[PDB]
UniProtKB/Swiss-Prot annotation:
Entry's family note: Belongs to the acyl carrier protein (ACP) family.
Function: Carrier of the growing fatty acid chain in fatty acid biosynthesis.
Species of origin: Escherichia coli (strain K12)
Presence of the UniProt keyword Lipid metabolism in the record: yes
PTM comment, free text: 4'-phosphopantetheine is transferred from CoA to a specific serine of apo-ACP by AcpS. This modification is essential for activity because fatty acids are bound in thioester linkage to the sulfhydryl of the prosthetic group.
One BP term from GO: fatty acid biosynthetic process
GO cellular component, one term: cytoplasm
Record protein name field: Acyl carrier protein
GTP-binding found in the keyword field: no
Modified residues (O-(pantetheine 4'-phosphoryl)serine): S36
Primary location class: cytoplasm
Lineage: Bacteria, Pseudomonadati, Pseudomonadota, Gammaproteobacteria, Enterobacterales
Pathway annotation: Lipid metabolism; fatty acid biosynthesis
Matching InterPro entries: ACP, ACP-like_sf, PP-bd_ACP, Ppantetheine_attach_site
Length: 77
């Protein structure tokens, strides 16, 4: 499995969106329909899966699927 596949799987599960809709360019809010609680839960789900903590102000700027994948590749240890 790749990081892209694992991250997309988690986003879809958390937001209640079908896999085909979770495209790399998709905006969590504008395209995937995420609300305020979804942001919190999606961030914690990804921090748990990839055992990494992202500052909340930084997470707020991660607005697309690809930006989440990029952060994980850049910080997962
Ligand atoms: P509500 O009115 O309180 O908040 C609505 C907002 C639009 C402000 C909130 O949903 C928000 O700020 N959304 C921005 C996009 C988003 O959901 N970002 C988080 C994406 S996932 C992430 O950053 C995790 C990266 C990997 C960490 C290991
Ligand atoms: Zn693999
Ligand atoms: Zn949908
Ligand atoms: Zn968009
Ligand atoms: Zn909600
Ligand atoms: Zn934490
Ligand atoms: Zn946080
Ligand atoms: Zn690790």
């Amino acid at each position: 499995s790749t990081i892209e596949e694992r991250v997309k799987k988690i986003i879809g599960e958390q937001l209640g969106v079908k896999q085909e809709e979770v495209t790399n360019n998709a905006s969590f809010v504008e395209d995937l329909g995420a609300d305020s609680l979804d942001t919190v839960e999606l961030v914690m789900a990804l921090e748990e899966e990839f055992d990494t903590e992202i500052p909340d102000e930084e997470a707020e700027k991660i607005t697309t699927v690809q930006a989440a994948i990029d952060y994980i590749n850049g910080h997962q240890a």
